[model samples]
Target: SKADEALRYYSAQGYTLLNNYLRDRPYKQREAIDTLLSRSYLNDEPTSAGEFDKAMKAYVADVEAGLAKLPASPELSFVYRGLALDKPELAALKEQFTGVGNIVVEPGFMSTSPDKAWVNDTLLKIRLPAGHGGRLLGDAAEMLFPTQTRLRVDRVVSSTSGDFDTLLNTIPTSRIKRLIEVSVL
Candidate 1:
């Protein structure tokens, strides 16, 4: 029975499957031997045969249904547009990605103005689909074109200070900045 008992922690994601499955199955069947037959994704190993596949299918249905109620990814949106025809949900997903453009900050070039020497205008544009496969990237995803979702982190970086203000009126130059740079995604 160790083989069956050991499945309880096979994979973390697999636990999601087990819980969801057990929630909908017979109540007393929870500890019965039949529960062992419920499914073992070997924790959803991704390349296995047997109950893992079944549980994965169930997971995918739950996933797809949940995804349908919300917006889809850009790449997936394009696929839905091609196949969904007039389906509003998919069409809506397709529309969300349309007219979206990738933007580049162009290394913050120094510009001088007669009134304000440090003030400058950052020119931005819509990225055309090209060698990079035309996928949107950079600040464009969050600012230029936005989705319905909102991020929890305010994570604003001050161009002047290069970081946020601290408790003191002025932080010392030697202070270590936690988020010093915006690395590429």
Candidate 2:
């Protein structure tokens, strides 16, 4: 009911209330709120599209509020993301990824792996401090990046057999892999 009250207050005063709601709450409570908000926004109902839209906006605001509280990094740091794609999906992506492209996390929050994992076919390397979204949980290395963030692709290395001998020596040769280097703009 505190969350309900905070949501009502936010509906009236916009981000001011939401910021205070996140700030005043304990870490677990804030994490709970994040989970609830994430679910609300991710709910895919044709009839409740409008409601979900508002939920997404609120969720983005919540992430921004949290990110604002983090201390700025003095030096450069980086974050990584891995994506598993089917053949068709990978083909389409290869077509679309040429030259300049834009990326947005539709859920309004982007969760990137803290350490590089070999579970996916696509890998993203993004610059940080500028792109340091927020830390949601202490136990997990997943960092949250806000929606509509600008980034530029610097390099793309793709191999059909994951035979990136120098770039990805650890990657298995059984699957396709694409390693993309990017930075926040």
Candidate 3:
């Protein structure tokens, strides 16, 4: 019981596994985020994308400057790509990754601009999906948080399926769902 009690500090951090698990099972992009948070990514914004980029460049520069200070190996190549992917300014390198498909790398957690959406005042919207748009990342399940976070934090990134259209129509009502005056779903 104490273990459960101590975990509550993970509140705003857990999101408190906010769904309670009894009826809440995370399913999509939130799945990735939930896993990270549950494992210890408790901090809010882990350095804005821009900052991560600058730091990564500096690290690579350090590594390059230390040529004779360390033995040359395959690891250098590892550091090379690592910095490129993590660093925001090095957008080209990330595009070169050719991995992490369904990728939408940008200067932010979301590729869209930010906004301060307020409950009872925010308007949500989504574009209907067209082929190849149905679950780019192994389907909407993995696309959950990406889709949902973008909706709340940014805007709809992409969409597919009649379900998405249905969601567009339904989420507004669901936004204030289950009779809770203030809820996030």
| Candidate number of the best lDDT | 2
Off by over 4 Å in 1: 1-48, 72-185
Q: Please give the lDDT score at residue 91 for candidate 3.
A: 55
Of the candidates numbered 2 and 3, which has the greater TM-score value?
A: 2
Native-structure RMSD, model 1: 20.4
- TM-score for each of the candidates: 0.18, 0.55, 0.19
Tell me the tens digit of each residue's lDDT in model 2 across 1-185. 33334333333434443433333422343443454454464444434546543664566565556454555443436667666644573555455543445442222344554555445767766666543554433321445554545567666677744444566643332253577666666
The candidate with the higher TM-score, 1 or 2, is 2
- Ranked candidates, highest TM-score first: 2, 3, 1
Better of 2 and 3 by lDDT: 2
Residue-level lDDT tens digits of model 3 in 137-171: 12101111111221112232123333344433433
Between which residue pairs do clashes occur in model 2? none
Q: Distance (Å) between predicted and true CA of 139, model 1?
A: 19
Compared to the true structure, candidate 2 yields what TM-score? 0.55
